[PDB]
C-alpha cells in the first residue's frame, strides 16, 4: 500500500531494497538539469521504415557493400573536452 511514492508512469521503483520515495533518490536527479544526449528507453516513433530491395543495384555491385559517405556521421566527444554532462544517458523510468 504505497500510495505516496515515486510513480514512474504506473510503476513504483525499487533501487536499494526500499521503494523510491521521491525523485531525489533516483540517480537521474543528479543530471536532471542537463539536456541529455539519448534517453535510454528509446521508444520508437511510428513504426520503422521498410527494407527497400532491388535486383539492379545488388546485381550490379556483385556484393562490395557500397557504403554512402555523405551521411550525417554523428560525432563523439573530443578527447580534450572531458565528456559533456550531456553524454550521460538519461534513464527516465517515469
Amino acid at each position: 500500500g504505497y500510495e505516496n511514492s515515486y510513480d514512474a508512469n504506473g510503476a513504483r521503483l525499487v533501487m536499494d531494497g526500499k521503494v523510491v520515495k521521491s525523485e531525489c533518490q533516483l540517480p537521474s536527479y543528479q543530471i536532471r538539469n542537463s539536456k541529455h544526449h539519448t534517453q535510454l528507453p528509446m521508444r520508437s516513433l511510428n513504426e520503422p521504415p521498410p527494407m527497400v530491395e532491388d535486383l539492379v543495384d545488388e546485381s550490379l555491385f556483385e556484393g562490395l557493400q557500397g557504403y554512402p559517405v555523405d551521411e550525417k556521421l554523428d560525432l563523439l566527444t573530443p578527447p580534450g573536452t572531458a565528456t559533456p554532462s550531456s553524454e550521460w544517458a538519461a534513464i527516465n523510468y517515469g
Binding site: 520508437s44 513504426e47 520503422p48 532491388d54 535486383l55 557493400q65 557504403y67 554512402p68 559517405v69
Partner: protein
C-alpha cells in the same frame, strides 16, 4: 606504388570518381529492430507413417514465422546406391492453408524439380546431405533427415507470416506422406520386409519482436507480395522409337508467373527424369554385364547426359501466338538456367523464365496467365532409337534421338511459379488482388 596510380587521373575518371557519392572503406550499417529467433517443435496430428496424412497448426509462440523444417527418421532397406533423396520422396506433398483458404501446395516432385533448378554448389550438396544418405551407408542404417519448406515465408524474413496479426485465422501445414519410398520400404515395385515406419517431427522458427514492432504488427494492416506454385500433372505423348511424337498441352495457369518449369519422368522411380542406359551411373549396374536398363542406379538417378532426355524441342504459345521461337530441349535444360539462375540443371528438367531473375524474390517481369485465354506448351520429343544397353549407341548418337528406354518417361509435370498478394486485416489473412 599505389600513389603512382592515384596521380594517373584524367577526364575518363570523372565518370567514375568525380564528385564522389559513395566510398567503400567505412561502411554504414543500418540500425534495425530488436528480435530473436527460436526453434519450436509443433504438435502434429495424425499417425505418421507411410501413406499417412498428417497436419499441424502453428502455435502462437512468436509474432512472425519463417523457416519450417520437417524432420524424418528413416532407415535403409538396402545398401548404399538404393535410395535417392528418400526424405523428399516421403514428403509427397505439403499444403499451406490460412483461415481455411489454401495459399499454396508443394509436391515431392516439386521439391526435386526446384532443387534441380535453383539450388547449387555446396548448397545443393548440403541439401542432399539432409535428405539422402551420401557417405555409403549400409542396410539397417538409421538417419535423421531435414526437409525445409520453400513457401514464400520460408524463404526470407521479409515475407515472414505475421501470425500475430491473424487473430481469427490459423495457419496450418498439411503433410502427405508417400505410401512408398525407394530404398527405405520398397525396392522398385517390391516391398522390403522388416522396413521401419518413419519418425516425424515439424519445427517452426518463430520471430520474437520487440514491443514497439510487435504492437505495430498486431494493429496495422499487412500486405506482402508472395509466391505460389501452380501444378498440372499430365501424360507425355508417348515417345517412340519410330518417330518424333509431339504434344500441345493447355496450361490451366493463372496469375503473374515468374517462370514455368517442367520435367518428364518415369513415375515408377522418384527423380528419374531421363532414360536409363548401360553407361556408368545411368542404370542399375550400368557399365557392366549385370547392368539393366529397366531399373536406375537409385543413388545416381540424376544425370547431366542430355542424350537420355526425352524432349527434342519446345515453345510456349499464347492465344495462338508464339511466345518465343522454338528452341531445343538443351536450350531449356542448359541456357535458361545459365542465364536465369546460375546453377546446373540435370537432364530431363527444363526451365523457361518470363523474368530476368526468377531465382530472386523481387519481381523482374512475369507472364500473367490470368490474361491468356489459351496458354499452351508445345513439345516435340526425340526419336527413341538408341539401344540403351549398348554404349556405342548411347554415347555416339545424334541430337534428335534418345534411348529406347525413354518411352518409359510417360509422366509430365508442369509447374508454374507465380505471385499473388497476401493481406492481413482485423485478425484475418488470405489472398488478395491488386
Amino acid at each position: 606504388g599505389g600513389l603512382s596510380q592515384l596521380v594517373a587521373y584524367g577526364a575518363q575518371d570523372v565518370y567514375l570518381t568525380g564528385n564522389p557519392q559513395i566510398t567503400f572503406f567505412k561502411t554504414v550499417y543500418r540500425r534495425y529492430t530488436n528480435f530473436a529467433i527460436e526453434s519450436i517443435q509443433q504438435t502434429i496430428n495424425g499417425s505418421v507413417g507411410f501413406g499417412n496424412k498428417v497436419s499441424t497448426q502453428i502455435s502462437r509462440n512468436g509474432d512472425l514465422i519463417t523457416d519450417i523444417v520437417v524432420e524424418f527418421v528413416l532407415t535403409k532397406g538396402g545398401n548404399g546406391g538404393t535410395t535417392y533423396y528418400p526424405a523428399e520422396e516421403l514428403l509427397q506433398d505439403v499444403e499451406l492453408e490460412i483461415g481455411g483458404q489454401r495459399i499454396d501446395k508443394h509436391y515431392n516432385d516439386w521439391f526435386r524439380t526446384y532443387d534441380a533448378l535453383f539450388r547449387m554448389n555446396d548448397d545443393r550438396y548440403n541439401y542432399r546431405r539432409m535428405t539422402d544418405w551420401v557417405n555409403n551407408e549400409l542396410v539397417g542404417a538409421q538417419k535423421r533427415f531435414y526437409v525445409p519448406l520453400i513457401f514464400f515465408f520460408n524463404q526470407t524474413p521479409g515475407l515472414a507470416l505475421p501470425l500475430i496479426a491473424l487473430q481469427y485465422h490459423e495457419v496450418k501445414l498439411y503433410f502427405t506422406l508417400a505410401s512408398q519410398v525407394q530404398g527405405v520400404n520398397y525396392n522398385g515395385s517390391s516391398a522390403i520386409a522388416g522396413a521401419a515406419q518413419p519418425t516425424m517431427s515439424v519445427w517452426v522458427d518463430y520471430i520474437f519482436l520487440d514491443t514497439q514492432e510487435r504492437t505495430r504488427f498486431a494493429q496495422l494492416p499487412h500486405e506482402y507480395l508472395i509466391e505460389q506454385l501452380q501444378f498440372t500433372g499430365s501424360e507425355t505423348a508417348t515417345p517412340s522409337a519410330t518417330t518424333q511424337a509431339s504434344q500441345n498441352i493447355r496450361l490451366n495457369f493463372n496469375h503473374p508467373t515468374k517462370y514455368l518449369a517442367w520435367n518428364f519422368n518415369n513415375p515408377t522411380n522418384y527423380g528419374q527424369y531421363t532414360a536409363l542406359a548401360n553407361i556408368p551411373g545411368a542404370c542399375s549396374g550400368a557399365g557392366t554385364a549385370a547392368a539393366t536398363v529397366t531399373t536406375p542406379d537409385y543413388g545416381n538417378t540424376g544425370t547431366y547426359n542430355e542424350q537420355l532426355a526425352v524432349l527434342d524441342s519446345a515453345k510456349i504459345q499464347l492465344n495462338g501466338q508464339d511466345r518465343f521461337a522454338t528452341r531445343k530441349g538443351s536450350y531449356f535444360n542448359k541456357v535458361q538456367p545459365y542465364q536465369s539462375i546460375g546453377g546446373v540443371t540435370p537432364a530431363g528438367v527444363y526451365l523457361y523464365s518470363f523474368a530476368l531473375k526468377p531465382a530472386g524474390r523481387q519481381p523482374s517481369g512475369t507472364c500473367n496467365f490470368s490474361r491468356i485465354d489459351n496458354a499452351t506448351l508445345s513439345l516435340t520429343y526425340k526419336t527413341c532409337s538408341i539401344d540403351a544397353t549398348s554404349p556405342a549407341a548411347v554415347l555416339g548418337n545424334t541430337e534428335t534421338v534418345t534411348a529406347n528406354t525413354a518411352t518409359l518417361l510417360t509422366a509430365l509435370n508442369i509447374y508454374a511459379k507465380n505471385y499473388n498478394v497476401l493481406r492481413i486485416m482485423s485478425g484475418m489473412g488470405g489472398l488478395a488482388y491488386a
